[PDB]
Every structure is written in structure tokens, then in C-alpha cells.
Enzyme design. Structure first.
Site, PDB file in Angstrom:
ATOM      1  N   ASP A 185       0.810  -1.210   0.000  1.00 41.81           N
ATOM      2  CA  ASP A 185       0.000   0.000   0.000  1.00 41.81           C
ATOM      3  C   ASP A 185       0.849   1.268   0.000  1.00 41.81           C
ATOM      4  OD1 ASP A 185      -3.259   0.437   1.663  1.00 41.81           O
ATOM      5  OD2 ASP A 185      -2.573   0.591  -0.437  1.00 41.81           O
ATOM      6  N   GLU A 205       0.343 -10.261   4.615  1.00 39.43           N
ATOM      7  CA  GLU A 205      -0.662 -10.692   3.650  1.00 39.43           C
ATOM      8  C   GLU A 205      -0.054 -11.456   2.473  1.00 39.43           C
ATOM      9  OE1 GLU A 205      -3.379  -7.631   2.500  1.00 39.43           O
ATOM     10  OE2 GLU A 205      -4.216  -7.460   4.536  1.00 39.43           O
ATOM     11  N   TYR A 236     -11.522  -7.126   7.108  1.00 39.14           N
ATOM     12  CA  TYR A 236     -12.140  -5.836   6.824  1.00 39.14           C
ATOM     13  C   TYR A 236     -13.623  -5.908   6.456  1.00 39.14           C
ATOM     14  CZ  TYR A 236      -7.536  -3.489   6.644  1.00 39.14           C
ATOM     15  OH  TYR A 236      -6.304  -2.949   6.951  1.00 39.14           O
ATOM     16  N   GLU A 248      -5.416  -6.147  11.639  1.00 42.41           N
ATOM     17  CA  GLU A 248      -5.939  -5.065  10.818  1.00 42.41           C
ATOM     18  C   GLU A 248      -7.451  -5.157  10.756  1.00 42.41           C
ATOM     19  OE1 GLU A 248      -4.099  -4.451   7.098  1.00 42.41           O
ATOM     20  OE2 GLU A 248      -2.073  -5.062   7.795  1.00 42.41           O
TER      21      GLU A 248
END
Ligand SMILES: [Cl-]
Lengths: 592, 590
Positions: free
Chosen positions: A166, A405, A461, A499
Site C-alpha cells: 500500500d 498478507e 475488513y 488489521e
């Protein structure tokens, strides 16, 4: 194969002067820097502060996005009293790739832009005179180097990066540069483990040196009072009535290492602060000093408006001011080793860190299939070795994260995990837990690597990437459905959420809420809290992110990532007060 | 002569002339000499109702001060020949002259109360007709609201008000074409008494003829529960459903003219609530039980209509005020559109109805030759307000000034007169009051005998002792509250302005003035103070929503003291009151 990553100290045997300040700086698109003599040094470029990411100092986009070779230049004085000592330039980070020239002569290269490395310049300089250091740094990403990514070429010729991660590709001399003079025979490394008995403790140490001279080890408390001493490179310091180091309650003893017998002046001295504490995983418990704990926190980057990815002591001290206020006691150094000064402050402030190596991007949106795995792996294991060597003695390091990840669904990921985990099982003398984050696509049903990590780190998420908005109710039920499956299979290791959250534009309000508003951030966090509290094996919550941070431009990135509890300026969104209330009501031994 | 709201039935018609009129500025004052009163179509289209200011891209138009003109064609049905024909203007800010087919019919002073023009003989029945309105929006010390008009060095006229809100002007409320009977209801009054589970509506009916009168009350399902004959009478309601705060029940009143034999001459219907209002020493009693006021703090201000009434914003403002736990608000600083009160009646809110007597003080005022005409217009607008809103169950009290300069001993004759000439206007005899500014305090105010209860405007932590000083500002406020308590205060006290400008999005830890956190900090402080004193019977915070204002270096694009943004989303302080107000019962402090 870095011979030593000890942090510079100053005493009568060791000197350390910083070369931070303004350097000369030039881009090299053509790659003709060396053909035309830039390595002897230059002053016809632009001034560039060090340490600092070079990207945001330019008004033109092509320079912000530059990808290729770039050069830093500087002059520095070498004192004549240094002749005969072991002389080093220590670079605390050059992102991502560096060749070091001193006075025109090439000294070494280095791969990986997040760990330190030193250049022996003993023979490359004139003593008692001005010398020149030039750095040829490189910037590009490939799937054979950490962080994973690609480099593409616009139709007009300019190179640019397409990362697999990111964060923004902030580059350059991101951390301090030291000039060191050390003894010829010196300390290179040491190691500490701890044991507790009643009100007493034992430090077990080892010391590596480049020679055969004797080693004395001495342990002093907070006020300078010596409490244990031992002789030799292995040993055991008996500390009666020890003052244990405690979460959000640090106590640090000064450790002193010296070389020589009592006919000599000490040939070398090294000094470091350590905390007496033990870390065990037991069942689903994380035990600090043999009592269970519950992790609360973030979720961080090293990102600031003016330094980019460079270390700034002011921003770091405010992050800790905020994190103490809000009730946190832990954070993960995502997604790369942080400046060493950060772990010293976690030791001083009693925080629990998850130290992460920069292995993001092992995930194409077929990764483990390909042929870049051979070279990638060398750099990965090497970056894991150097990370564990650098930070192993910090009381605040709790666990090592070895991926972020990665694509754990690919069955070809299992040979790679087996290798990485085998090769690292003994690097850390304290033998703390080793883990990684499981991405959202990587569940108890789809992952193939669930047997490896010592505890589980989930990135979930619901409410943002899936089941957003009014569907949030379905997202909570689907997360509860996953957590039901873990419970059925009977998790025997602890689970930590690392997260979750919600992009939030500060100042954006709506009633009722809509995604991106401050109110929606809170509703999402309250929802996660309700899940966490309903499962006994969930042993911590680390929200993403602490602050807003910069990112590659994109239509889903409202100038950077905006998932922060605080803004990039380090002021609180409404969610900060939510956690300020929840976390200071949860005790340390929550769930027990 | 009659300010009844239009209704539609077989005796009365009512058709709106809302839509796009034609519009022209008349900076020169030549419009009438130029023949514009006969109508025109060479200007710019302008919505009605709406303030004209915000539809122009140039500042010279937005700020225009002087004579402006609205023109429209409308159709008068043949069927209407023989009725009393009226143009009813719900509000023309601030001055109007009405022309129909070029003929001057009427003028009007005051820009927030309705007026009607009889056009029965100025139209061609069965064809198109023209209506032209010559408006003016100048300010002076002789008109409400008070201010001055200046000329810049470049000739242009500009207003400089003695109040905060912006000078939104033009056709700010609907225009009706009415058809009324020749003999008709003009006015009526209601007062209430309670006895056990029974109640008594005491009515009267004003008419412009001698035909018999017949009044009947029906419940919410349409059942009739009381009839009476005569222009005065008393309806006996057995087992009445009382109108309760945040719990309204509305009966339908029907007035009918004519004896039992003829065709009905006129019908008028309204909805009333059976409830009483008494100030008993230091309590506010609704239906003989003590209440505690919580609310705002309002303006009629929206992004696209300006000052003009917009039903969407109004229902949204009401949705929010119920969500937040409030039960009251003050129509600062002028009468609102009549729809605001009907919604208040249906939602059981308590309103303080305010006449535009704002700006009676300078940065003295009662020592000038302007009072004589000012007072004419003041007590006239008081009369029109009470005549218009009398019958609403939801109007709790009348406010006759906002922040007048009561420090000067010369305010005292004028208050004496205003308070004597309004003494017997409201049949329910509800309490008359006004707001005391920061400078007008127990120590310094000279009109403290007049109001029926005290309305306090205090700004510690904003205009005084801002920032880190807030603690000294809290201490000073308790100082003043101690001196009220010492002085043996016997009337109720209600805080009606307090707060802090807040830019939605500004966050700081620790806070600084203008951030969302500081606002919550300030509102918490005021709460702590309000809760340590028993005579304090209400908190109305300023303001409900960010509203527009004159340009100034302290006005960050208008006022920002609002709990909600000008778009009606919440700031963090929204949720503080949502928590607090939904936990204070309606009888807090009793
Ligand atoms: Cl030399």
C-alpha cells in the site's frame, strides 16, 4: 552477512559522529553517473536533507515519482586521531539499494532499504583531512527484492513503480549516517535471555568479539548501582530482588561489556539497556512474566508529511504520547523494520512490538509459482537474519512477523513457508513467537499454512472491503461465522486481530452514517469490539491505522490512506475517543 | 385586519402564486417614472419564495441595497367575481408597495409578517392580470430590525446591521391568491381551563357582519365533542386528551357563519391543543406540572433559499430536534413562517415567539430621535405577531426584544410603554420576556422588573475567557449566578444563548477554540453550571445550525456556533446533547 549491527555508542574506545545535514543530490535517468565521474563527488545538484525521503522536496511530479539510480554527495572530516582505529560509515537505511564510494573508490553495496549496514573505510580516507562520500542509491522494485513490486515504463520513457504494497515508495537516505571509529578488537554482538525464580531473576548472556581478549560483563540498575558481574563470553548474572520490566511499566538495567584484563586499559566497551522479562505462549495465552496479557494498539507506518519515510524524533515522540493517552500497549512495525530509536522508546515506555520484515507483496491480485522465488528467498532470509540480530535484545520486541498478507491459498506457498520457518527457528535466543498476518482472503477454510505461526494474526475488513455500508450487518454475521469455525476446530493458539477499520475523512459527518464519515468509523470499530469480546481465544486488537499515511495515487486513495485513528497531522478523529474509553477500561489480563 | 392562515373549503379558496417571477434592481429609483408598475419581462427570473441575494455571482448584486422589483402575470377565474379577492403576501423583506394592473393598492412595513391586499376591483375577471411588487431592504434606526445604510466612496449603497444574520431580502414567503366570502371570520381566540379529566375551551369569534356563529370541536378521529352558538362561548370537553410536551394531541375547531336555514356563509377550521401555561413563582407549568426546557437557538436560514421558508429544511430541522432530545426553540430573531408553528403543534414543541426587535444597541441607542417611529413599528409588529400566533398550543411565551441595551436608564421609559401596550393582547396571557445580553446582568440591568421570566445570553469561554482561561469564565458565571440567588430570584431563569464557533473537521488534543472538542468542552462547562442552581429552568443553546452572516474577519463564512452544519449534519457536540438531553426528564429539577 553484516558483521555487526550494534547501535553506535560514545565512550573512550568508541566514537560516533553523525553526518546528517544537507547533501548534494542528483538524479541519473541515463545511468551515466559513473561514466562521467559523479563518484568522486559533486556540488552541482540540489541540496537534500539527510535523513529524509527525497520525494516530497520537489514541486514536479516526475521527480516525486522518480525510479532509477540517484546520487547523494557530501564531504566529511576525518580526524587525525582516528588513524589506526577501525573506521566505519554506518548507514542506518538507504532505500532500497546502495553503492558506497569514499573518495572515488567503491567500498561496498547493500540490498534492502530498511536495515543498517556499515562500510569499512579504514583504508579509503586521508586522516586529518576532508574526504568525500558518494552514495549511488537505487529505487526500483522487482519480485526478487523486498518489498515486492514491479517497475514499468510509460510510453514516454520515464520509469515508474507499480508496488504490491500500500505505502508510498519513499526513497533515499531515510535514516542517519554515522562516522564511527572503533577498537581493532571489539564487541560485535551479544545476547540475553531471562529466567525468573521467586523475587529473583537471571540474565543469561553471550558475547561475540573479533578476538581472544577477556570479557567482563557488569549489570547496573536504574541508579548506577552494580548488582551482578561475570567473566567470560558465556555467563549468568544473578539479580536478587529483581525489578521486572512490565507492560506499560518499564524498568531498565544498564548492561556493560568490556574487553581486556586488569593490566590493560579496556580495549573496548559496549553499553546497552535491557529489561528483565519473559515471554511465553501457553495454550491460547500470551504470558509476560508468567501472567496473561491482552494486546491493544496499532497498526503503524513510519510516515510524516515532511520526512516521508525518514525517522523524525518529534513525530515518534507524539505517536507515543498519543498511544499512551489512548490506552494502547502494543503495535506492529508494519511493514518493515523501524529506525532503531523506536525500539528504545518502546523499551522505555513498556510497549510490546511485533517486529516485521519487509516481505509484503507475495500476492498478485500466482506469486509462489514463478522463478523469482530463488533470489527473493535469499534476500528474505537475509533480511530476517539481520532484523533478528539487530533487535533481539530489546525487551519490547514480542514477536517476529515474517510476512504480511502473503498468498497462503496457493499450495506452492507451503514449501516456501517450510523453508523460511526452518531456517529461522533458532535465530532468536529468546525464542519468541514467529508469525505473519493472514489476509482477508486467507481464512480457516482457505489457507494452507495454518500450522506454522506460533500465534495467529488476522487481517479482516468486513464493513470496508466487503459488506460495506448497510450490509455491515451481514459482515458481522460472516465474521462471527468464521470465528465460529475456529472455535469448532478448537484453536489451541492465541488469535490477534492486526488489521480492521475504515477510511475516514476527518470533518466528514452524516446522520445516519455513510462510509468515510467519522461516525461510520466508530460504528465499525464498535462492531468489531462486539465480536472480539464474544470469543475467548481472541487475545488482542490492533486497529489499522494509528495515523493516516501516504500511498501511491489511486482512485480509492483520497490522497494517501485514511484509515487512521488520527490524522497525518496527529490529531484525533472521533474514533480516537472511542478507543480512549474502551482501552483504558480493559485491564492488562483481560480474559483469563 | 385579518391574519388567519388560508384554508380551502367551499366558501374560501387559496391558490399559491409561487414560482418564477421577473426581477430587476432599481439602484436609481426610477422604476415608477419608467412605467415598471405595469409589469415587465426584461429582467431576470427569480424564484418565489426565496431570498434573491444568493442567486447572483457578483457581490454588487448579492449586497444590493435599495429598491427592487418583482413582476408576475396571474389568472383571476371568472367564478371569483363577487367574492372578496385578496393577494396575501406571507413576507416581503423589508418594505413593499403592491401594484395590480399598474394600480397601486397598498404598502407594508416589516419583512417577516404577512399582509393582504384587497384586489376585488383592480382585476379583469376571466383574463390574465399583472402583479408587481416594489420592495426595499434598506435599514435604519426607525425600522426593525435596526441598522444603518452607508454609501461607499464609489456610490454603491451598503447595509451595516446592528444584528448578526445576513440581510436576506425579497419575496421570502409564499404569495396566495385568496377568494373569501363577503361576510367572513376575521379572528378567533382560545383559552383553556382544566378540572379533573375535563377541560373547557373558551373561545371568541370576530366577524365583519351580524350573521349567527356556530363553533364545534372534533377529536382526532373526527368525532364531534362540543358545540356552541354565539360569538362568545365555552366548549365542555369531557375526558379530554391534553396536549403534552413532545406528546401533542390536536382537536379540530370549526367556525361556521349563518343560521340553521340559509346556505353557509363562511367556514373556518383550525387545529388547537388543550393545554395551559402558568408561571408559578420559579416554575414553568404546562398543564400544572413543572417542565424543563431544552433546545435552541434557531434561524430561518438554508443554503439555497436564504431567509425564505423551505419545508424540506424545516421537517429536517424537526427530525433532528426530536432525535436530540430537545423540546423547545426560540424563533430568533423574527417571526417564522406559519408552517413552523403547525409542525411545532403536531410535534409538541414549546416555542418562544420573537418580534424583530433586535439591534436596539450600538458598539446610547434609547437616546435618539428614532425611537418615536421605531416604537410605532415595534408595537405594531408585536400586535401582528400575537394576532397571528395566539391560537397555537405550542407558543409558550413572547419575546419583545433580543439584546436591547438595557444598561442605560433611558431604556426604562420605552420598556414601560412597550410592556403596558402589550399587557392585554394575548388572551391566554402567556409570559412576555426578552433576552439579556452579556453586558446586561443582575448588577447592571435596569429592566429586570419587566419580564415574566428571565432569558439569559452568556458567552463565557468564547467572547470572554476563551481558551485556557475558560476556568475563570466558569467562575465568573457562577459569580453572577450567586448574585441572582442572593437577590432572591423569584421568576424562572432560562439560558437562551451560549456556545462556541466550531469548524467541522478542526480537531486538536488538547483543544483550541474552533475545534469540535472545544465546543463539547464549553457545552459541558455550561451544563455543570446550569445543574448547580434551581432557578435555572432551561437551556437553549446557540445555535441549531450554522447560518449565514455579514462578512467579517470573525465570521468564517457565516456563524459557526451551530450544533449542526449548515447542511444539517452533526458535529461532535450533536452527540453530547443527544446523550444529555435524552436523559433529563421533562420535570428535571422539581
Ligand atoms: Cl592518511
Amino acid at each position: 552477512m553484516e558483521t555487526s549491527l550494534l547501535y553506535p555508542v560514545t565512550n573512550d574506545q568508541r566514537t560516533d559522529q553523525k553526518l546528517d545535514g544537507l547533501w548534494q543530490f542528483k538524479f541519473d535517468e541515463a545511468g551515466e553517473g559513473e561514466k562521467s565521474g559523479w563518484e568522486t563527488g559533486f556540488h552541482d545538484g540540489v541540496s537534500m536533507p539527510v535523513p529524509a525521503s527525497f520525494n516530497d522536496f520537489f514541486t514536479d511530479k516526475a521527480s516525486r515519482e522518480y525510479t532509477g539510480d540517484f546520487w547523494y554527495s557530501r564531504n566529511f572530516f576525518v580526524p587525525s586521531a582516528a588513524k589506526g582505529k577501525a573506521l566505519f560509515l554506518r548507514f542506518d537505511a538507504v532505500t532500497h539499494r546502495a553503492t558506497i564510494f569514499v573518495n572515488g573508490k567503491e567500498i561496498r553495496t547493500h540490498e534492502g532499504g530498511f536495515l543498517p549496514f556499515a562500510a569499512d573505510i579504514s583504508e579509503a580516507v586521508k586522516y586529518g583531512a576532508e574526504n568525500t562520500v558518494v552514495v549511488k542509491g537505487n529505487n526500483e522494485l522487482s519480485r526478487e527484492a523486498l518489498p515486492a513490486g514491479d517497475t514499468i515504463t510509460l510510453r514516454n520513457g520515464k520509469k515508474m513503480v507499480r508496488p504490491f504494497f500500500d505505502f508510498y515508495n519513499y526513497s533515499g537516505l531515510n535514516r542517519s549516517v554515522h562516522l564511527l571509529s572503533l577498537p581493532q578488537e571489539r564487541v560485535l554482538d551479544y545476547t540475553t535471555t531471562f529466567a525468573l525464580a521467586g523475587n529473583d531473576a537471571t540474565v543469561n548472556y553471550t558475547v561475540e568479539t573479533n578476538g581472544d581478549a577477556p570479557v567482563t560483563v557488569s549489570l547496573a540498575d536504574a541508579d548506577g548501582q552494580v548488582v551482578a558481574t561475570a567473566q567470560g563470553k558465556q555467563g549468568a548474572l544473578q539479580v536478587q530482588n529483581a525489578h521486572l520490566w512490565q507492560v506499560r511499566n518499564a524498568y531498565l538495567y544498564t548492561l556493560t561489556i568490556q574487553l581486556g584484563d586488569d593490566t590493560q586499559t579496556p580495549l573496548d566497551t559496549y553499553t546497552d539497556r535491557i529489561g528483565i522479562r519473559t515471554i511465553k505462549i501457553s495454550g491460547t495465552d500470551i504470558l509476560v512474566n508468567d501472567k496473561p496479557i491482552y494486546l491493544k494498539g496499532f497498526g503503524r507506518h513510519e510516515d510524516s508529511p515532511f520526512a516521508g519515510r525518514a525517522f523524525d524524533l518529534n513525530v515518534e515522540k507524539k505517536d507515543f504520547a498519543l498511544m499512551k493517552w489512548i490506552g494502547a500497549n502494543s503495535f506492529r512495525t508494519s511493514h518493515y523494520p523501524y529506525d532503531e530509536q523506536v525500539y528504545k522508546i518502546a523499551d522505555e515506555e513498556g510497549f510490546l512490538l511485533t517486529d516485521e520484515v519487509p516481505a509484503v507483496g507475495f500476492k498478485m491480485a500466482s506469486f509462489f509459482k514463478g522463478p523469482w522465488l530463488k533470489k527473493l528467498h535469499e534476500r528474505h532470509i537475509d533480511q530476517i537474519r539481520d532484523l533478528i540480530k539487530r533487535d533481539k535484545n530489546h525487551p519490547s520486541v514480542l514477536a517476529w512477523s515474517l510476512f504480511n498478507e502473503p498468498d497462503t491459498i496457493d499450495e506452492n506457498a507451503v514449501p516456501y513457508f517450510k523453508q523460511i520457518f526452518d531456517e529461522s527457528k533458532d535465530l532468536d535466543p529468546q525464542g519468541r513467537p514467529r508469525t505473519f498476518t493472514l489476509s482477508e482472503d486467507d481464512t480457516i477454510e482457505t489457507s494452507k499454512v495454518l500450522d506454522f505461526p506460533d500465534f495467529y494474526m488476522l487481517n479482516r475488513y468486513p464493513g470496508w472491503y466487503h459488506f460495506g455500508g448497510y450490509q455491515i450487518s451481514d459482515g458481522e454475521a460472516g465474521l462471527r461465522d468464521e470465528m465460529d469455525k475456529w472455535q469448532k476446530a478448537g484453536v489451541k493458539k492465541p488469535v490477534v486481530f492486526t488489521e480492521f477499520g475504515a477510511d475516514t475523512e476527518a470533518g466528514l459527518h452524516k446522520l445516519p452514517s455513510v462510509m468515510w464519515t467519522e461516525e461510520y468509523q466508530v460504528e465499525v470499530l464498535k462492531m468489531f469490539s462486539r465480536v472480539f469480546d464474544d470469543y475467548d481465544f481472541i487475545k488482542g486488537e490492533q486497529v489499522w491505522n494509528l495515523a493516516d499515511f501516504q500511498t501511491v495515487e489511486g482512485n480509492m486513495r483520497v490522497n494517501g490512506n485514511k484509515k487512521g485513528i488520527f490524522t497525518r497531522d496527529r490529531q484525533p478523529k472521533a474514533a480516537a475517543f472511542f478507543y480512549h474509553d474502551r482501552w483504558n477500561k480493559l485491564p492488562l489480563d483481560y480474559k483469563a
